[PDB]
Design an enzyme around this catalytic site. Structure first.
Site, PDB file in Angstrom:
ATOM      1  N   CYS A  89     -17.333  -5.691  18.188  1.00  0.00           N
ATOM      2  CA  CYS A  89     -17.235  -4.334  18.663  1.00  0.00           C
ATOM      3  C   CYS A  89     -15.872  -4.179  19.896  1.00  0.00           C
ATOM      4  CB  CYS A  89     -18.093  -4.162  18.308  1.00  0.00           C
ATOM      5  SG  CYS A  89     -18.398  -2.056  18.890  1.00  0.00           S
ATOM      6  N   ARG A 103     -17.847  -0.615  22.502  1.00  0.00           N
ATOM      7  CA  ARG A 103     -19.306  -1.836  22.679  1.00  0.00           C
ATOM      8  C   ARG A 103     -19.266  -1.206  24.602  1.00  0.00           C
ATOM      9  NH1 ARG A 103     -19.428  -7.556  23.653  1.00  0.00           N
ATOM     10  NH2 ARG A 103     -17.371  -7.782  22.524  1.00  0.00           N
ATOM     11  N   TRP A 130     -19.217   5.761  15.053  1.00  0.00           N
ATOM     12  CA  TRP A 130     -18.049   6.636  14.279  1.00  0.00           C
ATOM     13  C   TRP A 130     -16.779   5.977  14.221  1.00  0.00           C
ATOM     14  CZ3 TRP A 130     -20.756   7.905  19.517  1.00  0.00           C
ATOM     15  CH2 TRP A 130     -19.759   7.766  20.509  1.00  0.00           C
ATOM     16  N   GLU A 180      -8.989   1.819  11.489  1.00  0.00           N
ATOM     17  CA  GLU A 180      -9.683   1.374  10.013  1.00  0.00           C
ATOM     18  C   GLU A 180      -9.485   1.991   8.360  1.00  0.00           C
ATOM     19  OE1 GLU A 180     -13.933   0.218  11.418  1.00  0.00           O
ATOM     20  OE2 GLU A 180     -13.074   1.979  12.626  1.00  0.00           O
TER      21      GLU A 180
HETATM   22  C1  HEM Z   1     -19.908   4.318  18.147  1.00  0.00           C
HETATM   23  C2  HEM Z   1     -18.650   3.938  18.116  1.00  0.00           C
HETATM   24  C3  HEM Z   1     -18.066   2.238  17.567  1.00  0.00           C
HETATM   25  C4  HEM Z   1     -16.462   1.961  17.692  1.00  0.00           C
HETATM   26  C5  HEM Z   1     -15.550   3.082  17.410  1.00  0.00           C
HETATM   27  C6  HEM Z   1     -16.870   0.515  16.633  1.00  0.00           C
HETATM   28  C7  HEM Z   1     -15.958   0.316  16.232  1.00  0.00           C
HETATM   29  C8  HEM Z   1     -15.902  -1.003  15.949  1.00  0.00           C
HETATM   30  C9  HEM Z   1     -15.315  -1.932  15.025  1.00  0.00           C
HETATM   31  C10 HEM Z   1     -13.069  -1.363  14.963  1.00  0.00           C
HETATM   32  C11 HEM Z   1     -14.816  -2.660  14.396  1.00  0.00           C
HETATM   33  C12 HEM Z   1     -14.089  -3.885  13.481  1.00  0.00           C
HETATM   34  C13 HEM Z   1     -14.991  -4.210  12.905  1.00  0.00           C
HETATM   35  C14 HEM Z   1     -13.947  -4.465  11.052  1.00  0.00           C
HETATM   36  O1  HEM Z   1     -12.504  -4.415  11.607  1.00  0.00           O
HETATM   37  O2  HEM Z   1     -14.127  -4.269  10.430  1.00  0.00           O
HETATM   38  C15 HEM Z   1     -16.577  -3.084  14.871  1.00  0.00           C
HETATM   39  C16 HEM Z   1     -16.972  -4.315  14.308  1.00  0.00           C
HETATM   40  C17 HEM Z   1     -18.685  -4.769  15.125  1.00  0.00           C
HETATM   41  N1  HEM Z   1     -19.632  -3.087  15.069  1.00  0.00           N
HETATM   42 FE1  HEM Z   1     -19.057  -1.828  15.771  1.00  0.00          FE
HETATM   43  N2  HEM Z   1     -18.167   0.760  16.339  1.00  0.00           N
HETATM   44  C18 HEM Z   1     -19.090   1.288  16.734  1.00  0.00           C
HETATM   45  C19 HEM Z   1     -20.665   1.538  16.731  1.00  0.00           C
HETATM   46  C20 HEM Z   1     -21.159   0.265  16.969  1.00  0.00           C
HETATM   47  C21 HEM Z   1     -22.435   0.272  16.577  1.00  0.00           C
HETATM   48  C22 HEM Z   1     -24.057   1.525  16.711  1.00  0.00           C
HETATM   49  C23 HEM Z   1     -22.573  -0.590  16.284  1.00  0.00           C
HETATM   50  C24 HEM Z   1     -24.183  -1.161  15.957  1.00  0.00           C
HETATM   51  C25 HEM Z   1     -25.752  -0.796  17.150  1.00  0.00           C
HETATM   52  C26 HEM Z   1     -21.824  -1.771  15.956  1.00  0.00           C
HETATM   53  C27 HEM Z   1     -21.813  -2.922  15.371  1.00  0.00           C
HETATM   54  C28 HEM Z   1     -21.022  -3.577  15.436  1.00  0.00           C
HETATM   55  C29 HEM Z   1     -20.720  -5.218  14.783  1.00  0.00           C
HETATM   56  C30 HEM Z   1     -22.222  -6.605  15.063  1.00  0.00           C
HETATM   57  C31 HEM Z   1     -19.195  -5.660  14.334  1.00  0.00           C
HETATM   58  C32 HEM Z   1     -18.841  -7.058  14.028  1.00  0.00           C
HETATM   59  C33 HEM Z   1     -18.764  -7.132  12.336  1.00  0.00           C
HETATM   60  C34 HEM Z   1     -18.711  -8.098  12.050  1.00  0.00           C
HETATM   61  O3  HEM Z   1     -19.015  -9.634  12.833  1.00  0.00           O
HETATM   62  O4  HEM Z   1     -17.643  -8.550  11.040  1.00  0.00           O
HETATM   63  N3  HEM Z   1     -20.573  -0.487  16.138  1.00  0.00           N
HETATM   64  N4  HEM Z   1     -16.644  -2.018  15.618  1.00  0.00           N
HETATM   65  C1  LIG Z   2     -20.876   0.703  12.960  1.00  0.00           C
HETATM   66  C2  LIG Z   2     -19.846   1.082  11.929  1.00  0.00           C
HETATM   67  C3  LIG Z   2     -18.066   1.371  13.502  1.00  0.00           C
HETATM   68  C4  LIG Z   2     -16.648   1.892  12.738  1.00  0.00           C
HETATM   69  N1  LIG Z   2     -16.448   2.558  13.917  1.00  0.00           N
HETATM   70  N2  LIG Z   2     -16.795   1.046  12.266  1.00  0.00           N
HETATM   71  C5  LIG Z   2     -18.146   0.018  11.426  1.00  0.00           C
HETATM   72  C6  LIG Z   2     -16.882  -0.272  10.117  1.00  0.00           C
HETATM   73  C7  LIG Z   2     -16.471  -2.009  10.339  1.00  0.00           C
HETATM   74  C8  LIG Z   2     -17.745  -2.757  10.706  1.00  0.00           C
HETATM   75  C9  LIG Z   2     -18.574  -2.612  11.600  1.00  0.00           C
HETATM   76  C10 LIG Z   2     -20.039  -3.797  11.920  1.00  0.00           C
HETATM   77  C11 LIG Z   2     -20.377  -4.219  11.108  1.00  0.00           C
HETATM   78  C12 LIG Z   2     -19.216  -3.970   9.071  1.00  0.00           C
HETATM   79  C13 LIG Z   2     -19.643  -4.970   7.855  1.00  0.00           C
HETATM   80  C14 LIG Z   2     -18.807  -5.992   8.188  1.00  0.00           C
HETATM   81  C15 LIG Z   2     -18.559  -7.263   6.505  1.00  0.00           C
HETATM   82  C16 LIG Z   2     -19.168  -8.349   6.385  1.00  0.00           C
HETATM   83  C17 LIG Z   2     -18.831  -9.101   5.324  1.00  0.00           C
HETATM   84  C18 LIG Z   2     -20.055 -10.572   5.465  1.00  0.00           C
HETATM   85  N3  LIG Z   2     -18.824  -8.335   4.545  1.00  0.00           N
HETATM   86  C19 LIG Z   2     -18.559  -6.891   4.850  1.00  0.00           C
HETATM   87  N4  LIG Z   2     -18.041  -6.276   3.659  1.00  0.00           N
HETATM   88  C20 LIG Z   2     -18.259  -6.389   5.330  1.00  0.00           C
HETATM   89  N5  LIG Z   2     -18.401  -3.518   9.432  1.00  0.00           N
HETATM   90  C21 LIG Z   2     -18.824   0.314  11.726  1.00  0.00           C
END
Ligand code: HEM
Ligand SMILES: Cc1cc(N)nc(CCc2cccc(CCc3cc(C)nc(N)c3)n2)c1
Ligand code: HEM
Ligand SMILES: Cc1cc(N)nc(CCc2cccc(CCc3cc(C)nc(N)c3)n2)c1
Ligand SMILES: C[C@H](O)[C@H](O)[C@H]1CNc2nc(N)[nH]c(=O)c2N1
Ligand SMILES: C[C@H](O)[C@H](O)[C@H]1CNc2nc(N)[nH]c(=O)c2N1
Ligand SMILES: [Zn+2]
Ligand SMILES: [Zn+2]
EC number: 1.14.13.39
Lengths: 405, 404
Positions: free
Chosen positions: B108, B111, B280, B285
């Site tokens: 993420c 963070r 947000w 994305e």
């Molecule tokens: C507040 C602004 C936030 C931004 C800009 C953001 C952005 C991102 C982005 C760009 C990813 C990459 C995932 C992808 O490309 O599919 C990600 C992953 C992730 N986000 Fe954040 N996020 C935000 C908030 C949060 C919040 C509130 C949570 C949970 C409390 C969170 C939890 C996670 C987790 C657990 C992943 C890893 C997903 C995985 O394992 O594939 N994020 N986030």
């Molecule tokens: C909060 C939040 C903020 C933000 N800016 N963007 C997202 C969307 C990207 C994201 C963040 C965290 C977790 C997942 C789900 C990932 C996933 C995993 C598997 C196993 N299958 C899927 N279809 C998707 N997606 C979520």
């Protein structure tokens, strides 16, 4: 299921299993507790012997003569050479197969579909710095080939017990001077500050522009490095212009045609070639994105963005993304106009995918480093971004080695 | 043992000591790095120590490590697990754990925000109906008329002797994907499975490119139940370009609120199988993956054609030019609409600051280079040049199998 790494292309939903990685004899930096996958730099007789034996087997296997008596005699011959000298020599054909294999095995190289087409110059007879210069000039000449670039490698004599190495001090054969200015800043390539200063210390009269081609510091065993100026008509360069942006040519930017890495160490069956410059052709992003746009290099984004009259006050205008793309376009267009081999990141990565398929059949796998394979602009627009990859170290290999000063 | 971590732009160096707090194994061995795998193929005593460890983390955070209260609470947890094989979290401990699991998400880039997270305690829930009420209140609070606020709603934990509370949808807002006659997909092709599930369970569907799916919500050992989100709950942003008038004629939109609903929340060995969270969007994305991927909205070529670009050869960089413009339409549009969004430059810059804050607070920060570096213009941002250590810390968010 299958007791081997499962690797998936998320864009085509296809899966493979890597069995090649079992042939790995050297460990990388990851453990089960933490992946150090993103670090740039990793970290007597018995040892040499088993590396040599292993290499000989790859060689005989590659000519489909595994289990042969030529195969056996060769193993005996090598292990006799070492018990009496503490080293051995590679026959011509073996060296050719070893250098191709070390390229093929390079996890960070996106250009491996070409691995089979490498012109290997044996300079293992070289015995002086003046003579190293002749071999290097002949290398540039053949590799350049008036713009129609051909991959090559020149192999200088291997390391010997208690005897200084042949070294090329320059990190590439063509490098632009980087002059640290009175006022703190840098003229030319900030990446070549150290080496530029070495050349002056060694009696080079420096120039004063942004693209001054550096001389070569070359070192023969146990002698001080000597200094050689590459004759400019050997050093082919491309002045940069843009297909539609007329003012771009007026920037006065250029790049040289030949990418020739000269600092890496080449390892074959335990033998170590400290001097072995190699060249191929550039991928546009290396020049257009890294060399010209890195903040710690030529750093031209803002100058270009201002000529494009963009709003550089806010990140959200994507001025950096627009200027970068146009810089990369210029680079490609300028090489194509000048008829100098170059490849764009879409084509390169496409061919890398095809390489992955070849190697699955040929060897059962391909050692690949994702973060270096994926291009530095438009990553997810290339098929390699969606492709899982397994990274592990195979020998023969190119390695980093310490700077010799 | 404590890896050196270099930034190659600025040459600064740090050492990561936090990595030793890892108790879970990743995919890598000394033989081979397997860091680029998207998912892993990777008894009450495993629990007790995990709970002990967590209760320690929490008391450490409120500077009461070694208090009467801390030793007291420790024994209580040990008792509850020796009697029941499980245990319960005090609300303020849940609050701490949910933030901590965001903090620890290596993938993420967002963070720096970790401390600001509204936690809704939804552990008093015994029906899908109650699930739905909480979800509507979540969405409302989170969206906050365009001024987005991160939040998580936590539903009751898994119990050994029963099925889980689950939200079937992988996000709270999803655009339907309809299987068309010719084998093509109208709408978003990533949501075909779930669209058909919604139908199969009673939903009468639409036939636009951006129909908002209903929710399939599930209480333990019961059929899932269908719940239509009230349109006014779902804030949408029409897409247009600042200088290219025809862009808007493409009829594109995206929803304001990224709310992931398919992940399992792990806290001190307790598992919350239904705990949706929202933040947000980073503009890449929507503007890169959701619009540009061929398996998704696949608009790249259309856009390039209208840009008058030579689509015949890779070397014109038409793909690269179109993506930039699409990503720019996304930023421009959210800004026009007054909806919180962050660009990839600003996001990666805030992340660099996060690393520095975490270095000082905790002695490092687990990070997944391949996911932190955005999917366009990667080397253009500062994280590209930044080395990163990856390891699993707990509390954590993880994947779990789909409930069908
Ligand atoms: C507040 C602004 C936030 C931004 C800009 C953001 C952005 C991102 C982005 C760009 C990813 C990459 C995932 C992808 O490309 O599919 C990600 C992953 C992730 N986000 Fe954040 N996020 C935000 C908030 C949060 C919040 C509130 C949570 C949970 C409390 C969170 C939890 C996670 C987790 C657990 C992943 C890893 C997903 C995985 O394992 O594939 N994020 N986030
Ligand atoms: C909060 C939040 C903020 C933000 N800016 N963007 C997202 C969307 C990207 C994201 C963040 C965290 C977790 C997942 C789900 C990932 C996933 C995993 C598997 C196993 N299958 C899927 N279809 C998707 N997606 C979520
Ligand atoms: C012919 C076209 C070639 C292309 C397009 C190409 C492309 C690349 C690129 C882009 C990189 C990473 C560059 C960087 O970011 O620094 C790389 C790495 C590498 N290349 Fe290739 N290359 C080519 C030929 C060769 C040849 C002939 C060899 C050697 C015989 C070679 C050996 C290597 C090695 C050893 C690396 C890894 C560097 C490292 O480990 O840090 N390449 N290549
Ligand atoms: C043939 C070739 C083709 C091509 N298109 N580009 C290059 C230049 C990129 C490159 C390829 C291989 C090795 C190195 C430099 C090796 C190195 C050494 C040390 C000590 N630190 C580094 N960061 C990199 N650079 C070479
Ligand atoms: C920190 C990171 O690993 C480092 O900056 C790498 C990332 N990927 C790269 N990829 C390529 N091709 N070349 C590079 O120099 C780098 N730099
Ligand atoms: C196979 C590859 O690792 C995979 O597609 C990853 C790479 N990096 C990513 N990075 C982000 N932010 N999001 C992603 O979905 C991915 N995909
Ligand atoms: Zn790893
Ligand atoms: Zn796809």
């Amino acid at each position: 299921g299958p007791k081997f790494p499962r690797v998936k292309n998320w864009e085509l939903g296809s899966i493979t299993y890597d069995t090649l990685c079992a042939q790995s004899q050297q460990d990388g930096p990851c453990t089960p507790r933490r992946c150090l996958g993103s670090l740039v730099l990793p970290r007597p007789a018995e040892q040499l012997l088993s590396q040599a034996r292993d290499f000989i087997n790859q060689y005989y296997s590659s000519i489909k003569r595994s289990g042969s008596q030529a195969h056996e005699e060769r193993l005996q011959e090598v292990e006799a050479e070492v018990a009496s000298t503490g080293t051995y020599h590679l026959r011509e054909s073996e060296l050719v197969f070893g250098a191709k294999q070390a390229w093929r095995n390079a996890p960070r190289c996106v250009g491996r579909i070409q691995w089979g087409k490498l012109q290997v110059f044996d300079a293992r007879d070289c015995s002086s710095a003046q003579e190293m210069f002749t071999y290097i000039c002949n290398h540039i000449k053949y590799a350049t080939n008036r713009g129609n670039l051909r991959s090559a490698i020149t192999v200088f004599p291997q390391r010997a017990p208690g005897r200084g190495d042949f070294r090329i001090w320059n990190s590439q054969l063509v490098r632009y001077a980087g002059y640290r200015q009175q006022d703190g800043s840098v003229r030319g390539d900030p990446a070549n500050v150290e080496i530029t200063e070495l050349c002056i210390q060694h009696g080079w009269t420096p120039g004063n522009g942004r693209f001054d081609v550096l001389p070569l510091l070359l070192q023969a065993p146990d002698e001080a490095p000597e200094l050689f100026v590459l004759p400019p008509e050997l050093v082919l360069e491309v002045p940069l212009e843009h297909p539609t942006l007329e003012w771009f040519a007026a920037l006065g930017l250029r790049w040289y045609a030949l990418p020739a890495v000269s600092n890496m160490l080449l390892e074959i069956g335990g033998l170590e070639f400290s001097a072995a410059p190699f060249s191929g052709w550039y991928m546009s992003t290396e020049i257009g994105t890294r060399n010209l746009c890195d903040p710690h290099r030529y750093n031209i984004l803002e100058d270009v963005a201002v000529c494009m009259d963009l709003d550089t006050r806010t990140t959200s205008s994507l001025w950096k993304d627009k200027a970068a793309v146009e810089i990369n376009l210029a680079v490609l267009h300028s090489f194509q106009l000048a008829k100098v081999t170059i490849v764009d990141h879409h084509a390169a990565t496409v061919s890398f995918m095809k390489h992955l398929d070849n190697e699955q059949k040929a060897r059962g796998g391909c050692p690949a480093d994702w973060a270096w394979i994926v291009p530095p602009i438009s990553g997810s627009l290339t098929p390699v971004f969606h492709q899982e990859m397994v990274n592990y170290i195979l020998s023969p290999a190119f390695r980093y080695q310490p700077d010799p000063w």
